[PDB]
Design a binder for these strands. Structure first.
Ligand SMILES: [Mn+2]
Ligand SMILES: [Mn+2]
Ligand SMILES: [Zn+2]
Ligand SMILES: [Zn+2]
Lengths: 60, 611, 369
DNA sequence: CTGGCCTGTCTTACACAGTGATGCAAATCAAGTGTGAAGCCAGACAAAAACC
DNA sequence: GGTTTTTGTCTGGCTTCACACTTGATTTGCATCACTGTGTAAGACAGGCCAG
DNA sequence: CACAGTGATACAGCCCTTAACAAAA
DNA sequence: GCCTGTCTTA
DNA sequence: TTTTGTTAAGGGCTGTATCACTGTGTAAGACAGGC
C-alpha cells in the first residue's frame, strides 16, 4: 500500500523532530508530528500521495 | 506416555536424546537444533503416512500466508450456488475458528464482480457505431428498450433484461485476455503484438420451455435466452490467419454468454421482435467498425464476424419469415418441396438467403403479377412473412445418424417381409415382421427395442454387424449384397458429419461424400424401389443434399449441434430460486448477472486450479 | 459420532420389548409392517430413530453444556447422581412437501427442555434450553410421508415409538460422560401438539364438536354460560376408559346418552398428550371478542334486538373506517396476532369511545380493556 | 317433500422467510522503537507418588 | 520396604511478541432495505340427514 | 427417453521404505 | 389431397 | 565433499469415477376439432 500524505510527511519529518529532541518517545514524537502537521502548505504531500496511489492502483 | 506428562517431565524423559541431538547438530549442522528437530519430525510424519499435518507444519514454518483473493471467493460462491447469506456464514465461521481471513467478505466479492461484468473496461469503435451510444459504463439495461407501457398502448406482459451487445463483447474479450495472450505465446507470437484480431461470434437463441415454480393448476411461464459464443480468435500475421484461440467445448453451457434474458414465448412474434430488434441493430452496427480496447497495456483492434447458427429449425423459420415446419417447403436452405425432395434425392443447393427472403416477402406483399394465393405462394417459395434475423441454419451430427437409422430400420422390417417380392401385406404381417426384427436384434445384438426414435439406437444399429444379423432373416442373398453395400455407403459417409474437422481428419471421406451419396440414392432408387412414398424428412434431405455445402460453409457439422442448451433451463431455474431477489424487475437482472459470472473463463480457471 | 447409535449405554432395568443393542441408527419407520399384496396397501415411506438411542445421542451432543452448567452451579464435574431430563415431545404434519399431486409429511420430534441434578435434597438445574420453540433444538425422531389424518398409517408408524417411550418411563439410563458413568431419568411431556392432532391421538371428536375443551368436559353452551369456573379434568387414562365405556355400552343407553356419558371420547386414544395453549391464541381470542364488542357498542345492539344483517354490517364498516382514521388500522378479513396487538390498547378504546354516545359505557369498555 | 342446521372442501388473507443491495459505524492499516510481561535455561536434589 | 517415575525449588540473563499514538483513507461488521411467493389456517359455503 | 446430480462406494495412483552407487555440482 | 394444438409417454 | 536420482517390491491416504436411481425437460408422434 502507498502511504497517506501525512505518512510520507511523517517519514520525511522524523529526522527534524529527532535531531531537536533525541529521547522523545514514539507516542510523543507522533503526537507532536500530528499536532503541528494538523495545525498546518501541506498540498505537495497530498499530490505525492495521489501519485503513489494511482501508481499502486496500476500494480496488479 | 510422553504427551500425558508435563513439560518438566518430558524434558526429564528426553534429556539423553536432547544431549545426543545437540552433539549431532554442532558436529554436522552448525548448531541448529531447531532445524534438525523440525526435519526429524517432518520426516517422521511423512513416515506414518500423515502428510497433512507435515505440510501444515511446513507452511506455518515458511510462514506462507493462506489468503484467497476476492476473485477466487467469487469463483467458488458463483460456481457452488451459494447465496450471500450462506457465503457470509461460511466466511465468518472460517475466520472466527482459524483466526485467519481465508475467505474475503461480501463487499470484496461485489467489487470483484464489477470487473467481470459488462460496463467496466473502456473501449472505442472506429468509426463510432451507427445509432449505438458511445458510453462505456453501461451494464444491465432494460430489455424492453423503452417499449411503451401506457394503458393505451399494446399490453406489455413480459420482463426482460439485456446487455449492450458491444459492451458484452468487450466484457467477454477482457475475460478471455489470459487465454488470448497464452494462445499467441503457444503459436510462437508476441504478447505485445496488436495487429487486427478477428473474432468469430456464434449467435444463439432458444426458448427454455417452462420456467414456472409451483406449489395441479400450473400456469406455464416460458423464457427466451439470447446468447453468443466466441468460437475462435485469429490474428493476421502475414497473408496468414493464425488461430490464437478456439473454444474447446463450443456447445457447453460454460461458454454460452447470456446477452438477453426474457420471460416471453418464443412463438409470441410481437414481443420477440420488440425485445430482439435493438440487439440486432447493435449487431449490424458492429459489422461495420473496428473495436479498439486496451489489453495488457497494449491497445488492440478486433474485427467481428457474427454467425447466427444457434437457432433450431422452429426459431429459424420464425425469424426468417418461413412457414411452420409442417409445410411442403421442408428445407430452410433451398426451395424444395417434400415431394420434390423425395423424388430428387441428392441434387439440391443452398439457395435461400436473408436477402432473397426479404425479397420474397416483398413479392408476397405487393403481389406484382396479380396471382392467386396458390400461385403467389408457389412464386415466393413459402416466404409469407417478413424475416427479421439473419441466420445460418445447419444440421447436427445427431440428426444425420437418426434419419439414416430410421430409414435402415424400415428397410430391415420390409426386407424381412420380402416386400421386394410381395407388394401387399396386412397390418398383422408387418407387425410380425417388426416383432421378428426386434427379437432378433435383442438376441444377437443385445439391442433393446424402442417405441420412439432416438440417438444411440441409431448409433448402435448403424453397424455392419447388425446387417449380418438381419441378413440371417432374409431369404435371397442378392438382397444381402444390396444391404451390405447400402450400409457400406452409410459408413463411408458418416465420418464427414461426425468429425470435428473433416478437412483434416478424413479428407478422403469429405472428398468422396458427394459421390457416395449419389451412389447411395441410386442404390435406393434401383434395388429399393418399394421404399418411395413421396415422403422424406428434413434431416434426411439435409444429410443427402447439403452436407458438403454446409461443411464448405462452416468447416464442420458436429460442433454447430443443437445438443447443449437443454441444460440452460435448469441453470436458469436454479439462479431464480437461490440467487435472485424475489421481485419481478430485480430477479431477472440477478439471474442475468449470475449467469454472466457463471460463464466467465477467469473464474472457471480458478475452479480447475488442480489441473 | 453425531448420529444416533454410536455411544454405548444401559437401561436398568432393561427396557420392555426394546432391543438392548446400542449400535442401532436409522431404522425403517414402518417397523416391519407387512407389505404383501394381500395385506393392507402401504402408501408411505418413513424413517426413524429408536427413541432411547436418540435420547443418548442428544445428551452426548450437549455433554459440554451439562458439564459447564454443573460448574456454573458450583458443583463438581465428576458428580454422577441421578440427572432428571425433561423432554418436550412434539408432533405436526408438514402440509404439502411435493416437488413439482400433494405429498404430505408428518414429523415426530423431541426437545430437551431442562436437565437437573440432585445434590443432597436440592434439585439444582444444570441446563435449560434458551429457545424452546426454535427449529434448531427440535430433534427429529421420525419422518414420514403420510397424512396426519390418515389414522391407520399414523398409528401403525407411531405406535412403536410410543412403546419405546412407555418403556423408558420406568428405567434409568447409564451413560458415560467425560469418563465418568452418569445416570439419567427422563420425564416426557407431549405438549407440542396442536389441537387437531391432540384430538386425533386422544380419541376425541373433531374440532366442531360440542365438547370444545381438551382439558375438561365442558360443552360449548356450558363454557359460554359458566365461562370461568372450570378445571383441568381429562387425562389419558380417563380417555381410555371412556372409550371402553363407549365401546361396551354398559348401561344400554342410546347413542345420544352414550355420547353425553363419554363426553366425546368415541375413538380409542393411543398417545398421552399435555394439551396447552399458545399465547398467540389467547391474544387472538380476546381481540376477536373486543372487536365484536366495539362494533356492537357502535351500533348499540341492546336497543335493536331485531337488527338486520346489513345494519350490523354498516356498524362494522363505521368501526373499520374510524379505526383507520384514528389508529391507522387497515380493516381485516381474518384475525392475526399483529391486529390483536395493535387493537388491544387503551388508546384504541379511547378512539372507539369517540364513537359511543353514552359515557357510562365508556367506563365499562375502559375497565374491560 | 322442503327446510334449518350440524358437517368437510374451498378460498383467499396474511405473516414472513430470505433474496442481493445498501448504508453507516467501527475497526484496520501503516510507520516509527523502547519498553514491559512472559516462559525457559541450567544442576544438584527431595516432595509427593505409585511400581515390584 | 526398594525401585521406579512425576514435579517441583532457587536465580538471573536471553528471545519473542503486544502496546504505546497519531491521521485519515480504506476495509469490515452488521442491520437494514424493498419485495413478493408460499405455507398456514381463518374464514365462508353448499350439502344432505331427517322431520312437519 | 436421456441425463442431471444425489450420497455412497470401488478402484487407481500417490509418495514412500529398506541399501548402494554415483552423477551433478 | 389438411392444419394444428393437446396429450401421451419414451 | 555435498546434493539428489535410482533400482525393486509393496503399504497406506486421497482423488475421481463410477454406482444406483429417480425427476424432469424436451421432443416425437398420436389424435382430434375446425359446433
Ligand atoms: Mn427450441
Ligand atoms: Mn398441525
Ligand atoms: Zn435442401
Ligand atoms: Zn376447559
Amino acid at each position: 500500500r502507498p502511504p497517506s500524505a501525512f505518512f510520507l510527511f511523517c517519514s520525511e519529518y522524523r529526522p527534524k523532530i529527532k535531531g531537536e529532541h533525541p529521547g522523545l518517545s514514539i507516542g510523543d514524537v507522533a503526537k507532536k508530528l500530528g499536532e503541528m502537521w494538523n495545525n498546518t502548505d501541506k498540498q505537495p504531500y497530498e499530490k505525492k500521495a495521489a501519485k503513489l496511489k494511482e501508481k499502486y492502483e496500476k500494480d496488479i | 506416555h510422553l504427551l500425558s506428562l508435563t513439560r518438566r517431565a518430558q524434558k526429564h524423559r528426553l534429556r539423553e536424546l536432547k544431549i545426543q541431538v545437540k552433539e549431532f547438530a554442532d558436529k554436522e549442522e552448525g548448531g541448529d537444533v531447531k532445524a534438525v528437530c523440525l526435519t526429524l519430525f517432518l520426516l517422521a510424519l511423512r513416515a506414518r503416512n500423515e502428510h497433512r499435518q507435515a505440510d501444515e507444519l511446513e507452511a506455518i514454518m515458511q510462514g506462507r500466508g493462506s489468503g484467497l483473493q476476492p476473485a477466487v471467493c467469487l469463483a467458488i460462491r458463483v460456481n457452488t450456488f451459494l447465496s450471500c447469506s450462506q457465503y457470509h456464514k461460511m466466511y465468518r465461521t472460517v475466520k472466527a475458528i482459524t483466526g485467519r481471513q481465508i475467505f474475503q467478505p461480501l463487499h470484496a466479492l461485489r467489487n470483484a464482480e464489477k470487473v467481470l461484468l459488462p460496463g467496466y473496461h473502456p473501449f472505442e469503435w472506429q468509426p463510432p457505431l451507427k445509432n449505438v451510444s458511445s458510453r462505456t459504463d453501461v451494464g444491465i439495461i432494460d430489455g424492453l428498450s423503452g417499449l411503451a407501457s401506457s394503458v393505451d398502448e399494446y399490453p406489455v406482459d413480459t420482463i426482460a433484461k439485456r446487455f449492450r451487445y458491444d459492451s458484452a463483447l468487450v466484457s467477454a474479450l477482457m475475460d478471455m485476455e489470459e487465454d488470448i495472450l497464452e494462445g499467441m505465446r503457444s503459436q510462437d507470437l508476441d504478447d505485445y503484438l496488436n495487429g487486427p484480431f478477428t473474432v468469430v461470434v456464434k449467435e444463439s437463441c432458444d426458448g427454455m420451455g417452462d420456467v414456472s415454480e409451483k406449489h395441479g393448476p400450473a400456469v406455464p411461464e416460458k423464457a427466451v435466452r439470447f446468447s453468443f459464443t466466441v468460437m475462435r480468435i485469429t490474428i493476421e500475421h502475414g497473408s496468414q490467419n493464425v488461430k490464437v484461440f478456439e473454444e474447446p467445448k463450443p456447445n457447453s453451457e460454460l461458454c454460452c454468454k447470456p446477452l438477453c434474458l426474457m420471460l416471453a414465448d418464443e412463438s409470441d412474434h410481437e414481443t420477440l421482435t420488440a425485445i430482439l430488434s435493438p440487439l440486432i441493430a447493435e449487431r449490424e452496427a458492429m459489422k461495420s467498425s473496428e473495436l479498439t480496447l486496451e489489453m495488457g497495456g497494449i491497445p488492440r483492434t478486433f474485427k467481428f464476424i457474427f454467425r447466427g447458427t444457434g437457432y433450431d429449425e422452429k426459431l429459424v423459420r420464425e425469424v426468417e419469415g418461413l412457414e411452420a415446419s409442417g409445410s411442403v417447403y421442408i428445407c430452410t436452405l433451398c426451395d424444395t418441396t417434400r415431394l420434390e425432395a423425395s423424388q430428387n434425392l441428392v441434387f439440391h443447393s443452398i439457395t435461400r438467403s436473408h436477402a432473397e427472403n426479404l425479397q420474397r416477402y416483398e413479392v408476397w406483399r405487393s403481389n406484382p403479377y396479380h396471382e392467386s394465393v396458390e400461385e403467389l405462394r408457389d412464386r415466393v417459395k413459402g416466404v409469407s412473412a417478413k424475416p427479421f434475423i439473419e441466420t445460418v441454419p445447419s444440421i447436427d451430427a445427431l440428426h444425420c445418424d437418426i434419419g439414416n437409422a430410421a430409414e435402415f430400420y424400415k428397410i430391415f422390417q420390409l426386407e424381412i417381409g420380402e416386400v421386394y417380392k410381395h407388394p401387399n401385406a396386412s397390418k398383422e404381417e408387418r407387425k410380425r415382421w417388426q416383432a421378428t426384427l426386434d427379437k432378433h436384434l435383442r438376441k444377437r445384438m443385445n439391442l433393446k427395442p424402442i417405441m420412439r426414435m432416438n440417438g444411440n439406437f441409431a448409433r448402435k444399429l448403424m453397424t455392419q454387424e447388425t446387417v449380418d444379423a438381419v441378413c440371417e432373416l432374409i431369404p435371397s442373398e442378392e438382397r444381402h449384397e444390396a444391404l451390405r453395400e447400402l450400409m457400406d455407403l452409410y459408413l463411408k459417409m458418416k465420418p464427414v458429419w461426425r468429425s470435428s474437422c473433416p478437412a483434416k481428419e478424413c479428407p478422403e471421406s469429405l472428398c468422396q461424400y458427394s459421390f457416395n451419396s449419389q451412389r447411395f440414392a441410386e442404390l435406393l432408387s434401383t434395388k429399393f424401389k418399394y421404399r418411395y412414398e413421396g415422403k422424406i424428412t428434413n434431416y434426411f434431405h439435409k444429410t443427402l443434399a447439403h452436407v458438403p455445402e454446409i461443411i464448405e460453409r462452416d468447416g464442420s457439422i458436429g460442433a454447430w449441434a443443437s445438443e447443449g442448451n437443454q441444460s440452460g433451463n435448469k441453470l436458469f431455474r436454479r439462479f431464480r430460486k437461490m440467487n435472485a431477489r424475489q421481485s419481478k424487475c430485480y430477479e431477472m437482472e440477478d439471474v442475468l448477472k449470475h449467469h454472466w459470472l457463471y460463464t466467465s473463463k477467469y473464474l472457471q480457471k480458478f475452479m480447475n486450479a488442480h489441473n
